Write a protein that binds this ligand. Structure first.
Ligand SMILES: *[C@@H]1O[C@H](CO)[C@@H](O)[C@H](O)[C@H]1NC(C)=O
Lengths: 40, 24, 50
């Protein structure tokens, strides 16, 4: 079976998750992506 | 090759259960 | 504090929970794997009428 894979990298950057009612992760933002994200 | 990683890469950086709260 | 069985849901790799400000909320016992909210002991102020 022919396969496709992707490689990405982790960096030491601050992320703001919203821990929701489920004890889970449903969305997060990166404090260094764009100027607006720094505001959040 | 180049592709845009939209939203993945998020995980639990620890072993503590936190509920219903924003956390950076 | 008072030990009340944790009604909230956990995850298989989740040993204990915390709400905020270091105040640990829930803990699972390290022997039988049962989940419990831990509430700090009830306390209040006392005033007088003189
Ligand atoms: C997550 O929480 C919601 C609302 O609190 C609930 O309906 C659901 O059953 C919970 N569990 C999931 C989505 O696995």
């Amino acid at each position: 079976g022919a396969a496709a894979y992707y490689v990405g990298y982790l960096q030491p950057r601050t992320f703001l998750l919203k821990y929701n009612e489920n004890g889970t992760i449903t969305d997060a933002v990166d404090c260094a992506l764009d100027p607006l994200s720094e505001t959040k | 090759a180049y592709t845009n990683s939209f939203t993945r890469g998020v995980y639990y950086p620890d072993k503590v259960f936190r509920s219903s709260v924003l956390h950076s | 504090g008072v030990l009340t069985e944790s009604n909230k849901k956990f995850l298989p790799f989740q040993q204990f929970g915390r709400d905020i400000a270091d105040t640990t909320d829930a803990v699972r016992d390290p022997q039988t794997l049962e989940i419990l909210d831990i509430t700090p002991c009830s306390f209040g102020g006392v005033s007088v009428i003189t």
